[model samples]
Target: TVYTFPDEFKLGAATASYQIEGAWDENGKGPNIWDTLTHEHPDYVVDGATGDIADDSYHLYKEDVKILKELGAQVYRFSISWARVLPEGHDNIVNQDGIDYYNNLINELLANGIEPMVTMYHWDLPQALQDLGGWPNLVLAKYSENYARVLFKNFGDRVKLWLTFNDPLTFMDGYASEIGMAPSINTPGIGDYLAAHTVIHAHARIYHLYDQEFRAEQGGKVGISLNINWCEPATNSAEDRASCENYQQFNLGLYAHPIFTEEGDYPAVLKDRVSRNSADEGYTDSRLPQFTAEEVEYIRGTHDFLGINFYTALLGKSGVEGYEPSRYRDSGVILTQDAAWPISASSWLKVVPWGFRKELNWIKNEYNNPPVFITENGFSDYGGLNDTGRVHYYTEHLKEMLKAIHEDGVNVIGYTAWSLMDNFEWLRGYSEKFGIYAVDFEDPARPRIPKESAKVLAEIMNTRKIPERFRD
Candidate 1:
């Protein structure tokens, strides 16, 4: 029997602006936080590589569309560099050249009969915004709304699916640790929480903007892309199960609760734990920001759907051991993976296909079941054209997602493989490859060659079925 995906599911591929479109300072593009990170602190990246010329997707987007078309993909998800279009990080200084670049990309994709999904911010905040206190400062929330207007004014007519932010859980770490990610600020608990607070407001503001302004004409959908690993309990004991629940509420619920839940506020566990911990630490107020009733209402129900990015799973045990004054300590959940699990090129990512099914079920039970898009799901490796591990990764993950949809009744609408090609992998630089297409970083032209997995995925998308060999 052929295992088929739901008829409505749109299979596609994804890439981020910072990860792919690397014309760093070309055409009126202003500097972003990632720009400052790689250029100024090259020592941070393990490979000492920068995205300055990554995949050159800025110039080679047409070829990208050609590849997606060949794969029979129905949609393409990519992010916009806020600084590229809004040179000063606000709509006041719009750049035409920056606009034209995306315009060309969107138009080319449209001609190839592919739907374009755009992410407004993919962790590449303008340096101008960073100078003014960035995500932690509430001022940037308003600035984000202004920037969304520019996106709606130009691209909303064509791009129907808009993801407001990609994985605040990952990017917020930019503030939580000194050496981790872009903007690489070291405010720990304080900065990460504040950044998330402002981001929720920004998400709500953008959603309402689309509702009031663009809905009638554009008929588009607005959402956010969030990433999380499956949090499996280390033991069947009540403490471990509760510990994993606490971990989910703190990690995913921090960003997702405000938007998707009926209550429209941070999870109760987070507020309680953070407030208690803050009091113990002699802080006058909770480091986690409070949302007023009005603010909560504004944020509640802000999403049309949710884009989820999943890669691996981890076991959570009941413990309070990690860096002090950080999110890790706040949740009091010790996260670890079974050493037996197959590891990937990235140190943290471990393969556990069943975790994907369990994760979707958790989301369904937690948030009352919002429509979901598997926005970014791909396995990473050092480099390869054969890529048998990656082939198994997609097959198993897709199989689990199908189970979530058909068996568990999860409302999954679509799926986008993590990348269309290998480009830049942020702090790790180009060391960890996550793309189905292999890109030659050494070549100036940055040619893309499809790995064996690409041909396998194309078959899945084209047939809309898991091949017979994988049948249960």
Candidate 2:
């Protein structure tokens, strides 16, 4: 059997600025939260490695594009560092050097026949903005729109695909758990809702900005990337099944509900559960903020497509046991990875390819079948050029994604491998490799050498078909 992709099904690779674009302080770029975190508290990151010179993509972008050309990838999805473009986190001090850097990369990619899908923000909020209370600050929603305007006015002419933010589900954790992600503020339940509250508004405001100010001229689409690991009920009992529903309602639904669903606001389950927890904890109001009547209409139908960044799954049960008054407790769900599931070099990521199919079907049913753009999906392993583990990871995942598209009729429009080459892997540093091309951190050049997965991806893209060997 052979599996063919839709004629317009896009295939590509992805990278983020702080993960790959080094030159932290070079060329008038102000410090972002990640910069402050990695520099101020070096011990916070495993292996004490920083993106100070990770892959050196800032200086070697042409070579980065060269790799995309070689791989025959049609699209290159990367993020714009908020601090780099708006040095002080506001348009008051726009940085020309940062502007020039992306212009060159976008041009280089276009020249090589690769479409560039730009992510406006990937959690590198400027230190100036973080100083003003970070995402919890409602004012930054307007500031974020200001930043998006700069991106639109500058690059929207060429870049057709735009993702406003990458995975608020993961970044919102930065506010919930102090030890995780940049600007690691430990507000737990309170800050988690507030930050996510601000983010939902920011995404909606930015979407409107493009639609009102730029869409007529640019003729491009803007969407927000929300990540969700599929949640499987630990048992077939009604209680565990309801727990799975609650987990999805909170994790993905927190973001997706306000935008993708017809009766937009937050999921009723999320609203009811959190409010109940807040009252029990003696809070005057629900820890989860409510959007005003006008605000509900403003955010509804805010997306041209929904960007999904799925990587793994977890088994969910009925009971919860985290900090009291926390998101875990409010949702009343406990999550654990199946011990039988194969683990990856990144402990957080497990190889459960069927979860990918299940999640796609869930989205299709849950959101009235919105066009889904798979923003990030890939595997991580210990570094190696042969990369047999990664090769199967790609094959198995694609086989499932194809099932969603062909059999389940899931409206998946595009897919990008998680990375083009290895760079900074956040708190874990460079210990886990997610790239199809292996990078040499030991060498100053940070040369990219294609692994077995790269060849497999290129062959798939070139033919617009999943390899015959993997088909059932």
Candidate 3:
């Protein structure tokens, strides 16, 4: 059977600004949270590695582009460094050099006949923004809009696909949990919710700004890039099932509810849980921000599309004690892992393909069938030319994707592999390799090696199908 992606559907790969773009401090680029956190809390990073020169793509982007050309990726998703463009995270001081670098990269991508899927911000907050309370304060939202406006006036014309933020929900959780990511805050659940609320407001602001000001002229589209992981019930029991749904409401709905839902509020159950917890914790008001009528109106219909990033599924079970007397206490499940799940090189990344189909259904039903795109989906493997695990991972996930599209009727527009080349993986730094084309950090040129997965993936994407397990 010749399983084919829709004619309109695209295939591509994704890379982050900080992950692939080296030259951390080159040009007039200002410091970002990654810089601050890595320097301050070196322990947070594996092997204490920083992205100062991960792939050195910032300087050698053309070489990176050449690899994309080699792979025949139809669409290329990349982010602009906030500090590189805005320098100070404000429009008052536009970093000309920073802008030039991005302009050059975008232009080069266009010249190569690659469609540019531009992401405005990809978790790397300018250190300046971090100084002003990052996403916690409402001011950060306004600042983000201003910075986005600059990019709109400059590159919005050519870049039809724009993503406002990459995975605000995940970023917030990390910040609040104080797991020591950049702008690491220890506030946990509530802190993240508050920050995420502000991020939605900011996204809405820029989204409207684009539709209002740029759309008429530039003809650009914008949406949020979400990292959607799976939450599975531990067992077939009713209690376990309810817990899984609750976890989905909080983790997935944290950001999506506001922008995509007509109600434009936090997930009702989560809101209630937080409010009850705050009251019990002896706080006067709920830590979660209440969306006003106007805010709701603005946030609702804010998205032009849903860009999804998926990996593994986490098993969920009921009864986490952190929120006793809180609505969460009544809630069903918390994130967990099955003993049988395959743990890739990264501890958190377990291989769970069926979860992808579940997530696709969840997004379609919850968002009222919003047009979706799979922006980032790939497995990680330690450095090697033979990444058969990655090949298996892609086969499983892509099969699930095909099932969703053909059998499930999901309007998923595109599927992008997590990365095109191996670059820095957050605090893990150079430790994990998610890219199909491996980069040699050992060599100054950072030589690129096409892994077994790369060849298999290339054939699948080009022909749009491969035999089961995709033997190389």
- Point to the candidate with the largest lDDT: 1
Q: Per-residue lDDT tens digits of candidate 2, residues 116-212?
A: 9999989899999999999988998999999999999999999989999998878877887667788888888898888999999999999999999
Collision count for each candidate, in order:
0, 0, 3
Task: Give per-model TM-scores.
Answer: 0.99, 0.99, 0.96
lDDT of the candidates, in the order given: 0.92, 0.91, 0.82
Q: How well does candidate 1 match the true structure, expressed as C-alpha RMSD?
A: 0.9
What value does the lDDT take at residue 447 in candidate 3? Answer: 82
Off by over 4 Å in 1: none
Error of 2 at 156 (Å): 0.6
Sort the candidates on lDDT, descending order: 1, 2, 3
Clashing pairs in model 3?
176-188, 243-333, 273-327
Cα RMSD for candidates in order: 0.9, 1.0, 2.1
Candidate 3 local lDDT, 123-224, one digit each (tens): 899988888778877888889889888999988778899999998867875555566667778766566666887898899999988887889998777988
